[PDB]
Design a binder for these strands. Structure first.
Length: 50
RNA sequence: UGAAACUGUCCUUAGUGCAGAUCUUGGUGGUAGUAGCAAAUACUAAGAAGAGGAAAAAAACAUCUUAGAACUGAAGAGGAGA
């Protein structure tokens, strides 16, 4: 579970959802050690729901 | 180095000697990898094509399809004419 409010606190509004995708990609890199990270379609849609 | 013309002496002739003219024409520096590439709300994900996203995150990736999110808001960023 990613406490995204810690990363997107006081962030520019037009760069919240795009920066959410960047943060997740960094956590997958620091964990699975793989640079090739592919997002599911559902995960992208949830991030942009709001 | 260069590959087909040239030189010395005496007279004669002159469009005859350049550092300057904000000189003319052309070429080139420091400035300097500097000032900048900041109006028009905004893009993200998967796939295809392509030499062209690689990687010790090189954090960004043009085009097309689908999905999400959006803008012009109908005296329009629509459809048509002089």
């Amino acid at each position: 579970t990613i406490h995204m409010h810690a990363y997107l606190h006081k962030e520019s509004f037009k760069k919240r959802a795009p920066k959410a995708i960047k943060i997740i990609r960094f956590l997958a890199i620091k964990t699975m050690k793989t640079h090739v990270v592919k997002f599911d379609m559902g995960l992208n849609q949830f991030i942009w729901s709001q």
